[PDB]
């Protein structure tokens, strides 16, 4: 397989992406799936594909939310039969260089804990907020640990976002060398 920039003019790659998003997050992607993928094709954003044979085995994107300095990692999906084989790691690393070249300094993302897959859920997050964030533990293979192993740190939490004790975990990473103090 090869990871490279997404052919934004390939109708098949786009359909494959639409299918991948609908099979992974059907609650977020539905009938207007094609229109949502077209938004991911916007010139200002970055679109990186992981392709093997005739399949889109993975995809990653980033939106410039704060000028060209603050990018959001959205989305990131690997085919179910292709996970835990480093595609995600290679895709995130590829995105980081894409962002850096465009003047980006940091990439952030938000990953919710809806299935009680982290110790940050089912607990009053306003109580010892940051002591809890620090002592976090993965209970159900929650993707937060993935980003953590890639250098992203939990920089914030949104308590009770998806209902009682179901927070949104905010993670970020500065991709370029700090100009010192
Ligand atoms: C931006 C958003 O929408 S949030 C992103 C959430 N994405 C999803 O849940 C979609 C479905 N999942 C996937 O696409 C993938 O499993 C990803 C993107 C979460 C990870 O990609 P993969 O290629 O499967 O993981 P990769 O092989 O790079 O794993 C790298 C390391 O992180 C670990 N890791 C990967 N996924 C997870 C996870 N869900 N939970 C815990 N650890 C994980 C791996 O075990 C490995 O650790 P090791 O080096 O100690 O062995």
TrEMBL record:
Top-rank taxon: Bacteria
Matches recorded under InterPro entries: Acyl_CoA_acyltransferase, GNAT_dom
SUPFAM superfamilies: Acyl-CoA N-acyltransferases (Nat) (SSF55729)
GO MF entries: acyltransferase activity, transferring groups other than amino-acyl groups
Positions that bind CoA: 76, 78, 83-86, 88-89, 110, 141, 145, 149
Positions with a binding annotation for acetyl-CoA: 76, 78, 84, 86, 88-89, 141, 145, 149
Domain N-acetyltransferase: 1-176
CDD domains: NAT_SF
Protein name: Aac(6')-Ii protein
Native source organism of the sequence: Enterococcus faecium
């Amino acid at each position: 397989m090869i990871i490279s920039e997404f052919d934004r003019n390939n109708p098949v790659l786009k359909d494959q992406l639409s299918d991948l998003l609908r099979l992974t997050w059907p609650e977020e992607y539905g009938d207007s799936s094609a229109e949502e993928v077209e938004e991911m094709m916007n010139p200002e954003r970055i679109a990186v594909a992981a392709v093997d044979q005739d399949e889109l085995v993975g995809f990653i994107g980033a939106i410039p939310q704060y000028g060209i300095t603050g990018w959001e990692l959205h989305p990131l999906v690997v085919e179910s039969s292709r996970r835990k084989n480093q595609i995600g790691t290679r895709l995130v690393n590829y995105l980081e260089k894409e962002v850096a070249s465009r003047g980006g300094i940091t990439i952030y993302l938000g990953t919710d804990d809806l299935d009680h897959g982290t110790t940050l859920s089912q607990t009053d997050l306003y109580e010892h907020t940051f002591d809890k964030v620090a002592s976090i533990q993965n209970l159900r293979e929650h993707p937060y640990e993935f980003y953590e192993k890639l250098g992203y740190k939990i920089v914030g939490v949104l308590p009770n976002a998806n209902g009682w004790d179901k927070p949104d975990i905010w993670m970020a990473k500065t991709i370029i060398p700090r100009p010192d103090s």
